[PDB]
Every structure is written in C-alpha cells, then in structure tokens.
Amino acid sequence: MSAIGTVFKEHVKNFYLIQRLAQFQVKIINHSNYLGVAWELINPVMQIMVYWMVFGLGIRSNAPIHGVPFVYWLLVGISMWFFINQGILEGTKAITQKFNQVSKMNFPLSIIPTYIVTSRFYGHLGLLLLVIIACMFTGIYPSIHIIQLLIYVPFCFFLTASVTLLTSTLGVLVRDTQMLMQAILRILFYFSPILWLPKNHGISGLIHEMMKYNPVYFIAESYRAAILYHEWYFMDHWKLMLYNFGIVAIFFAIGAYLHMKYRDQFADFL
Amino acid sequence: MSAIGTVFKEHVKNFYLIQRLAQFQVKIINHSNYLGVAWELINPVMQIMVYWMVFGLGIRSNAPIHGVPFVYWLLVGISMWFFINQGILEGTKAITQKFNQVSKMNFPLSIIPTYIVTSRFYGHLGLLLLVIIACMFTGIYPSIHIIQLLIYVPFCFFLTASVTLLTSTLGVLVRDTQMLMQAILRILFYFSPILWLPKNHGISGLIHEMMKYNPVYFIAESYRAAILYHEWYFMDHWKLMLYNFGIVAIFFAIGAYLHMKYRDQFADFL
Amino acid sequence: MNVSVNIKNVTKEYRIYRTNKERMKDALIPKHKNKTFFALDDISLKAYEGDVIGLVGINGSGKSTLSNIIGGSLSPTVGKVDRNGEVSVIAISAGLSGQLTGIENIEFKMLCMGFKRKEIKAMTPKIIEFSELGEFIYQPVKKYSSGMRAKLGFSINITVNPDILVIDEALSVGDQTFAQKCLDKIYEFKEQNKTIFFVSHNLGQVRQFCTKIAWIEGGKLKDYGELDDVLPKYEAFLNDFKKKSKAEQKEFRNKLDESRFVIK
Amino acid sequence: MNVSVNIKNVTKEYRIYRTNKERMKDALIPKHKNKTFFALDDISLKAYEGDVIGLVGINGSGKSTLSNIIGGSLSPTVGKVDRNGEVSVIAISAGLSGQLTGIENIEFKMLCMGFKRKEIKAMTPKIIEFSELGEFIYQPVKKYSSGMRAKLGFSINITVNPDILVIDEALSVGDQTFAQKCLDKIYEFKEQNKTIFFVSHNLGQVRQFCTKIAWIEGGKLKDYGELDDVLPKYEAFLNDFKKKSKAEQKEFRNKLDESRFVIK
Ligand SMILES: Cc1c(CC(=O)N2CCC[C@@H]2C(=O)O)c(=O)oc2c(C)c3occ(-c4ccc(Cl)cc4)c3cc12
Ligand SMILES: Cc1c(CC(=O)N2CCC[C@@H]2C(=O)O)c(=O)oc2c(C)c3occ(-c4ccc(Cl)cc4)c3cc12
Ligand SMILES: Nc1ncnc2c1ncn2[C@@H]1O[C@H](COP(=O)(O)OP(=O)(O)NP(=O)(O)O)[C@@H](O)[C@H]1O
Ligand SMILES: Nc1ncnc2c1ncn2[C@@H]1O[C@H](COP(=O)(O)OP(=O)(O)NP(=O)(O)O)[C@@H](O)[C@H]1O
Ligand SMILES: [Mg+2]
Ligand SMILES: [Mg+2]
C-alpha cells in the first residue's frame, strides 16, 4: 500500500522533468538522420501502406466494412498499435540499458520507463491528428462524439506505462522476458479487430468471445466509435470499460510492489 | 576490378578468423539468458507457431497444397526467412556500431559484416536439420534429390552477405537507409510463396509474373523441391538460377567498389 | 568545527558466484548462503567543515566504493552515513554523451539536476568561460580530447555550488595549468567552508592539495590523521614493499585476499 | 643506431561543419571547400633503436593524434611514416568488454591478433601471473577497478612481444608498485632493443622513464632533443604561463586557435 503511494508521489512530483527528458530522448534517437524527426511520422505510415496492400487489396478484395471503406477502417485502428508496440518493447530495456548513467544521478528510478513511453506518445498524437484530417475527404466530419477521445486517448497511455513499470523490473531479474515479449505482442496483434472482424456462430464464436479479453480490442473499437461510427461507446460496453480499468489497476499495483521490493538490489542483479 | 580481387583475397585469407569471431559473437549476444544459446532455436519456432495459427488455421481453413499438408509446406519455406531477415538487419549496422573497437585493431574491415552473418547461419542450419527430422513423421523420407541442398543452402548465404557488404557502406554514408531497410524486407516477405501461392489467369497473373523477380521465391521453391516434392529443380528453372547468380554478382561488385572507395574516409563520416 | 559528514560502522559485502546461473538460487528461497567479499569493513569517518581529505591506498583498496557511498550512488549493507548538505562526485569518466555536443550535454546535465531553462541559459556563459573550449564547444563531444572532456565536466560540476565535492582521480588527465586553476578554486571553496575529498595516485598533487589523510588497506582504515603524520607512513610502506622480494609480495597479497573472502 | 620509426612531413586536417547536415554537400560534388582545422602540420620525426621518447604538451596539442598515426589507426592527409616492426598501443581505456570476464577478454584479444588456441592456453598463465588479479580473473571485468583493468590490459599487451610499444597515459591510474614493475619491464625491453613511446602528464614519471623529449605546441613540433635540454624549457614555459594574467592567457589561446583554423 505504501509502494503505490510512493510511486504515485514520485510521478506527480516529476511531471515536467519527465516531459523534458522525453523531448530530449526524441532528439537523441533521431540524431544523424538527414530528415530528422520526420521519420517518427514516416516509419509507421509505410507500414500501414503494406498492411493495406496485403490484407486490403489481396485479401477481402477491398470490401467495405459496416458501410465504411476498408482503408479508413484500417487507418483508425492501426494508429495506436505502433505506439503501444514500441513503448512496450523499449520500456522493458530502459532500466537495464541506462542504469549506470542514472545510478550516479539523483532522480527517482520509477520514472525512467515512463518518459521512455512519453518519447513515443508524441508521435502517436501527430499520426492521430493526420488520420482525422484524412477522414474529411470521404465525407466524415468531426462530431460531438469525438469528445470521447478525452477519455480514450489517455487510457491507452495509462495502459502502456502500467505494463512497462512491471516488465522493466521483471526484465532485470530474468533476462529471458525481453525475448518472450516479442512473442506475446504478435499474438496481441493478429487476434484483434485491427485487421479482421470475427463472424461468430461457429468455431469463430469462441474466438470472438476470447478476443474480448484482449485490451487492444477495446481501444480499437472505442477509437472507431469515437471517430467513424458516431456512437456513444460507453453506453453499450461499460462492462469492458470496468474490466480494463481493473486490469490496469492490477498491473500498476503488482508493478509498483515488485519495483519497490527489489529496488535496492538492482546492482547485484545487473 | 582491383576492389573485387582485394575483397576476395581478404575473405579467403581470414576464413578461420571469421568463423571464430562468429562463434564468439554468438556467445556474446546470449550472455545473461538462463537458457543460453537455446533461444536461437526457441525464438524462431514460436513465430512459426503464430504464422500457422493465423494463416493456416484461420485463413485457408487448413487446406493442403500440392498434396502436402500445409504445416510442413510452411515449415520448409519459413526456415530461411529468420536467417535472411536477421542477417540483413544486423549487418547494416555492423560497421557503424563496432567501428571504434576495430579501428585500433588490425584486421580487414570488409570481413566485419560477414562474420555477423555467420553468427546467424549456425542457428539456421540447426533449424533446417530439425525440419528434415520433423518431415519423417508424415511419411516423407530423405531421397537422392536432397543432394541439391549442397548447391542451395550455400547460395542463400552468398546472397545475404552480398547484400550486407553493400548496405553497411550505404549505412555509413547515409543514416536513413537503416530505417528504409525495415520497410523493404516486409515487402519481400508478404510478396513471396512463403505463406501463399498465386492463382494467375487474372489480376493475380501480373502478381505471379512480378513475384518471380523476388530472390526469396527461388530459395523457397528450391528448398521445397529438394525436401518435399522430389524433383530436380534446376532442369525446369535454370533461367531463374542464372538471373539470381547475376543479381548476386552485381550486388557483390557494387558493394566491393563502394566499400573500397570510401574506406579511408570512414572516420569523418561516422 | 561543523561536522560535515559522519560515517559510523559502514560495511559493504558483495556476493560472488563463479557461474552466472547461480544468481537465482539465493533469490527465490533464502536458505542459501554463498561466498562473500568484504569491500569495506567497519569504517568510521568524521569529516568537519573546511577540510581537504585525501584517500590513499593501493589498487583495489576500496576508495571508489567509499566515495560512491559518500555520494549516495551506493547503499551500505550495515551502517549509516549522514551528510549536512548536497554532494557532487566527479570521476575518471563523467557523464558526457559522445554523440551530443557541448551545449546539449550542458543542458542535459543541468536539466537532470533540476534547473529551469532560463537559469541554464544564464549559467551557460560562466561554464563557457571556465572551460576554455572556444569553438569546440559547438563541435560534438566525441571530437574532444580527454583533457577537454575533463575540463568540461569539472566546469559543469563547479559552476553549481555543492556543499560537499568529491574528486576521484579526475585531474589525472588534466595538465599543470588546469591543476593550478583547480587549486585556486579549492582555496576559494575552503574560504566558503565547503568540504572537499580528493583522490589521486600522484603524491605531489596530494601533498599540495590535501590537509588530512585517510589510509585504506584491504577495506579497513589503517590510519586517519594529519598529512604530515599519515603520509610518511604510507611512503615508508611503499618503499618497504619495493624492498621485498616477489615471493614476499605474493604472500602479502594472498594474505589480504584470504582476509577479504569468507564463506557465510 | 637502427632507425626504428621515420616520419617525414606528416600533416592532418579535419573538416569542421557547425551543422550536421552540411556533411553531404562536399561529398557529392567536389567544388565545396569548407573550414579546416590542422591537427598536425609538418611533423618530422626520427626514432632510433633503444630509445624512450616522451611527448609533452598542453591539452589539445596533438599527442594522441601522433600516437595513433604511429600506431596505424589513422592515415595522414599528407606524408608518409615507415616502421621497422610491429607496433602496439595502450591507451587510457583499452579494449575490454565489461560483460565478459578476464579469461574471455584475454582469448578475444589474442584471437583478434591471430594466435592459435593452444598458444593462447600456453600464454595465459604468464598473463595471470603478471596481472596479480587472483580470483577476480574469473569474475566479470565490470567488477574490476580502474587499476585492475589497466593491469590486465598492460599485461596482455606486454606478454606478446612488439617491436614498438606506445603508452598513452595508461599508467596514470596505476599505483607506484605497478609503475616500478613497468619501469623494470621497460629496462628489459631497452635491453631487447625495442622502441618505447611514453605519454604522461606526471613530470616525475616522465623524468624517471624517458630519455628523449619531443615538445608539441598547437600541432607543431616546438623542440625535439635530449631530456635534460628540452624538459627545462617546457617547465620554464609552464612557470611563465602561470605568471601571466588571465587576459594574456586568453590572448595566447586565441592566437593559437587563430593559427590552427583556416578556410580552404
Ligand atoms: C489472396 C491471398 C490469400 C488467399 C488464399 O491464398 N486463399 C485463402 C483461402 C484459399 C485461398 C487459396 O488457396 O488460394 C492469402 O492467403 O494470402 C495472401 C497474401 C499473403 C498476399 O500478399 C499480397 C497479396 C496481394 C496484394 C495485391 C494484389 Cl492486387 C493481389 C495480391 C496477397 C494475397 C493473398
Ligand atoms: C478468417 C480470417 C480472415 C478472413 C476474412 O475476414 N475475410 C477475407 C475475405 C472476406 C472475409 C470476411 O470479410 O470475413 C482475415 O482476413 O484475417 C484473419 C486473421 C488476421 C486471423 O487471425 C487469427 C485467425 C484465426 C485463428 C484460428 C482460428 Cl480457429 C480462427 C481464426 C484469423 C482469421 C482470419
Ligand atoms: N559490483 C562489484 N562486485 C564485486 N566486487 C566488486 C564490485 N565493485 C567493486 N568490487 C571490488 O571491490 C574492490 C574495491 O574496488 P575499488 O573501490 O574500485 O578500488 P579502488 O579503491 O578504487 N582502487 P583503484 O583501482 O585505484 O580505483 C575491488 O577488489 C573490486 O574488484
Ligand atoms: N575527429 C576529430 N575531428 C575534429 N577534431 C578532432 C578530431 N579528433 C581530434 N580532434 C582535435 O584534435 C586536437 C588534438 O587532440 P588530441 O591529440 O587528442 O589532444 P592531446 O594531444 O591528446 N592532449 P590530451 O587532452 O592531454 O590528450 C584537439 O583539438 C581535438 O579536439
Ligand atoms: Mg577507482
Ligand atoms: Mg589524449
């Protein structure tokens, strides 16, 4: 119970420091590139193109879903994936890679992965903006139902960090987890409504019921409801909201407790 | 013309040094893992499982191809992909990452990426062996047509290195190439017979004719012919053999010339 | 006579496993007890105000561990240490990114310590003037020489005002003029009643820098006292060790190693 | 009187761009000519057999660049240098992987130089005995102290027999007993007619180590000669610089910087 309060106080006190360190890391990782920070917008976009050529043109024969063209249906759902994947992959190695340079320095060690995640959120936001701007050419204009983003965009962030704060510590104790993570995330990608929609009423009905436990399902569907479908998502699916809030709370509690228990003995393990 | 001879002499003279350095790098990259070098066999296998659950069980409804079960058809074709992808991705950053530690040391700089590739080939070989061992449970036993591997397994290697020797130098001059490579390889993965077979006689006929220019097509088809189909592959498709040999020669020539021209001015650029 | 730093029974152990796979054995069930190495053992220290204290000892004695414990990057296994102020430590390789330039490194370092951007821009010219870097302040740090990097780090640390300053062989790469400038700065800091710890393997620099001496031999404080008392004993011990034959030196080192290691 | 190393008109320039994006401008079309910095300019050197030559100069003079040019890790812009043998260079931070242990580091280093495994296993005990590392040879290198790492690197380099040996401030971290042992090894190497270059900022170590002195000031060889002739001039220059006021020192540094930079 003291670990949660300690971590919350550390994060609340160092908000601006976290923001500045994330802004500096963004420049650090894009040092020698000629285009600069433009790659943060170029690297995901190309991937989207590939995912439209394979799963949109090849499979599905470019058939629309729910009265919406498949291109924008994929565009809305694919936006958060790059941020989530990159944040989870890089936050697991944040403490291990950058321990010596910060062991001498005097700032809380629980905010090290967080600003790493904050180094990617920026880019996600930019992409999101473009997607909305790209949605007006079909005839889809912003409505009141977009205010729901104020609840949905933060939650995704609060998910990713909640994972990393755990997986960083679990990465220091056992080094094999960094190899297992790459295997897990792929399963979280293909078993999601990002590229396909299950049909139910058969062997895919069990798949549909099992997919609801994936937190990516809720984020993608909520984004689509806010931007595309013009629907208040929380009126029909508040059970998913409560389940995901509980998942986030459990992850945060376990991560904080484990981080505070093994914080002193980091040097012996690493 | 002197660059090709110089690079060939450097590689021929330092064969055992390349092997020993690759063996040492294999141990270096698997230092703190509890399982050790077993992950070199565990990391690809899991991926294969995912690729069987999505494209084999979900799509295609587990339908056999050419009288062979889809599981082994995918197993034979997926074996080389991990080696090719990892070698091309890590060899592009070999000179940039490890320049200072070798600038003081006195060995040829053209053999630096090569042993990096040799750090992965080992693992590929192991996987290949298991695949053959896994093929006997269906009723597929080794035949004389397997001797073709003596021509086909080396060629893939001679392909990957031939790429890296170029992309390393192109990586030093311009840093953006390391970001472009990740975009290219995905296109080389999905437009290949690794997961699907085109139908032709339509809009996929142009796709089928365009896929023959991908060098992964030749490697996958030759492996399947040697192991699964019991067929002398070079009797019907010697044009593809000649085209791929020409591609490899062109890549080697351009890479050697560019490496020898800019070798002296590496420190100023990096 | 203000007690700046007080150390009472500080003791540090390290767990030694020959195999990397034995780390998990003692972490999941607490019944395992392996071999341990005493980096420090029963160190008691009292550093007053306006004091320059020099740590002396042979390689592997435990001076860097004590300096890090004073700084705070390490936590003692047994015992406590209290400091009346803010400490800053400079080492043989400070925190400077090779890819970054001088200005980016400066702003990174002063952002980690918690300074606003206007304060950073106001304090930058003093660092620029003290470093004597000139045009190269705009060039990347990797282009610097070792002395230039040491000057930049020392100026960055000096410009902010610490209550306690620790130097751990940082001046070895710097030349004589930089040493004289640092000596003048140390005199000014003594006038400001700061506490300075100085570690170096150059005995003339120790003589002209320090005023009190702490001698560490095998993790144990052999002697603490004034310069003129402790330093001659250390020099006499060095000459006596030079006199001894190779077998005697090996036996002495083996005895120290036997004392330091224990299975518990 | 065997000419060990000969250097005739060695000159080194570096291209300075304030912006990182200006590198490609001069690489695709050769009409561009930017500002350049003369790291060295018209250096002529003659090192005979059985000579200990010490390089002296203030920070940024160009001693490390000359040592690297002699070693071969750098290529002069104009001029040539010939060596009658095999050279080896030790620096302030040699090649030692932190994750690897001592034995793995030893086998890596002797594999890079081209020794068979049986030769490596035969030569390992000599390195073990010379390093005085003991149990810690089995521990990872990151657990080592700075002096222990320096001892391991020096022993690795010494065990193999080089015709020319270059030391670039490597002994600064080592203590006095290690310095005496290195002095004995240097005497033996002088008896074996090897050529040793020694760089250090400790003038007593230079006096007790070297026999000839080369003075480098702003990339130009001010004076080459015997120890007893060149060293007093350098000391007198240091004292005179200490005498000068801050403005005069700044003017002198600015004049050197003006001389070194040129737009061509
Ligand atoms: C069509 C297709 C099936 C379907 C398939 O092959 N199936 C599944 C059920 C049975 C049927 C068959 O047996 O033929 C597949 O699986 O992967 C594909 C991948 C991995 C593909 O990447 C790229 C294309 C593609 C892109 C653009 C254009 Cl213009 C044309 C093509 C593409 C199509 C398929
Ligand atoms: C079936 C399927 C289509 C087909 C699809 O959706 N299509 C294409 C033409 C029109 C039709 C449709 O509109 O429904 C797809 O595209 O991706 C998928 C992904 C990305 C999938 O990952 C996992 C499964 C899966 C795995 C195991 C089991 Cl037991 C069950 C499922 C899976 C199925 C599909
Ligand atoms: N993480 C660690 N695990 C085990 N042993 C360690 C660790 N860190 C340091 N040591 C040992 O602790 C002892 C003290 O090291 P250290 O304090 O750095 O020496 P020192 O006093 O600085 N002498 P010097 O080489 O001149 O710096 C040495 O024997 C080290 O090998
Ligand atoms: N790659 C480079 N590009 C530009 N300038 C460089 C580069 N490498 C070194 N220099 C400069 O060349 C000069 C000589 O550096 P260096 O030879 O390391 O000094 P030094 O003689 O070793 N003095 P010290 O600091 O005691 O080592 C310095 O002004 C460096 O900044
Ligand atoms: Mg130390
Ligand atoms: Mg130097």
From TrEMBL, chains A, B:
<feature type="transmembrane region" description="Helical">
    <location>
        <begin position="121"/>
        <end position="142"/>
    </location>
</feature>
<dbReference type="GO" id="GO:0140359">
    <property type="term" value="F:ABC-type transporter activity"/>
</dbReference>
<feature type="domain" description="ABC transmembrane type-2">
    <location>
        <begin position="35"/>
        <end position="262"/>
    </location>
</feature>
<keyword id="KW-1133">Transmembrane helix</keyword>
<protein>
    <recommendedName>
        <fullName>Transport permease protein</fullName>
    </recommendedName>
</protein>
<feature type="transmembrane region" description="Helical">
    <location>
        <begin position="149"/>
        <end position="173"/>
    </location>
</feature>
<dbReference type="Pfam" id="PF01061">
    <property type="entry name" value="ABC2_membrane"/>
</dbReference>
<keyword id="KW-0472">Membrane</keyword>
<feature type="transmembrane region" description="Helical">
    <location>
        <begin position="179"/>
        <end position="196"/>
    </location>
</feature>
<feature type="transmembrane region" description="Helical">
    <location>
        <begin position="241"/>
        <end position="260"/>
    </location>
</feature>
<feature type="transmembrane region" description="Helical">
    <location>
        <begin position="41"/>
        <end position="59"/>
    </location>
</feature>
<dbReference type="GO" id="GO:0015920">
    <property type="term" value="P:lipopolysaccharide transport"/>
</dbReference>
<comment type="similarity">
    <text>Belongs to the ABC-2 integral membrane protein family.</text>
</comment>
<keyword id="KW-1003">Cell membrane</keyword>
<dbReference type="InterPro" id="IPR047817">
    <property type="entry name" value="ABC2_TM_bact-type"/>
</dbReference>
<feature type="transmembrane region" description="Helical">
    <location>
        <begin position="71"/>
        <end position="89"/>
    </location>
</feature>
<dbReference type="GO" id="GO:0005886">
    <property type="term" value="C:plasma membrane"/>
</dbReference>
<keyword id="KW-0812">Transmembrane</keyword>
<dbReference type="InterPro" id="IPR013525">
    <property type="entry name" value="ABC2_TM"/>
</dbReference>
<keyword id="KW-0813">Transport</keyword>
